[PDB]
Amino acid sequence: RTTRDDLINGNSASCADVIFIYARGSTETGNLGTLGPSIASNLESAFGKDGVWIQGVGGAYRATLGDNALPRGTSSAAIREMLGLFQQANTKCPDATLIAGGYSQGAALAAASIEDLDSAIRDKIAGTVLFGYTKNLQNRGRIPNYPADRTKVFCKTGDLVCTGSLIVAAPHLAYGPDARGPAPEFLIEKVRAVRGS
């Protein structure tokens, strides 16, 4: 449900073909929050329970509201935690295709991590989805050092965080439908583009 640690718990001798690393929004529960489970269910339908590992970013990532105001839109501790998960994935399962996503503060965290990532690992992330991307304006809708074709940003009209602000308005909480359909659709398409099927 709201907590998934498939990568950490996963057996290296039986690596999934796809590994999804996801960062929740501020004040959300578990390590998946409100949107992660919906994405997870759909990925499982496409690749099978044994075909995909769902890993939320927990540990040092406390998803503290105040951290949105920090330089990168999240804490240094949180970036360290997500970088460590990508590193663990790369080590435990070198042939797995990676995919990532984040919501709100988690979207900033995802962008910051991917930006700092070793290029050899970053290049393994076939697609990334960002909802209510807090650095959308600042980054011009991109993730630094990461291709636009592998990025999909969901930013609703009226969601002030997508427009350079840190104010939380109603549209910021309306990504449910996106997480249930277009987000996983994008991720599945990007994985199949490289892995075939």
UniProtKB/Swiss-Prot annotation:
SUPFAM superfamilies: alpha/beta-Hydrolases. Optimum temperature is below 30 degrees Celsius. Optimum temperature is 30-40 degrees Celsius. Changing L166A: Increases activity on p-nitrophenyl butyrate, poly(ethylene terephthalate) (PET) and polyamide 6,6. Changing V168A: Increases activity on p-nitrophenyl butyrate and poly(ethylene terephthalate) (PET). Pfam families: Cutinase (PF01083). It is an enzyme of class 3 (hydrolase). The active site is at S104, D159, H172. Disulfide bonds join C15-C93, C155-C162. The record marks S26, Q105 as: Transition state stabilizer. GO terms for molecular function: cutinase activity. Inhibited by n-undecyl phosphonate (C11Y4). Inhibited by paraoxon. Belongs to the cutinase family. PANTHER family: CUTINASE 1-RELATED, CUTINASE 2-RELATED. This is Cutinase 1. It comes from Fusarium vanettenii. The lineage of its organism: Eukaryota, Fungi, Dikarya, Ascomycota, Pezizomycotina.
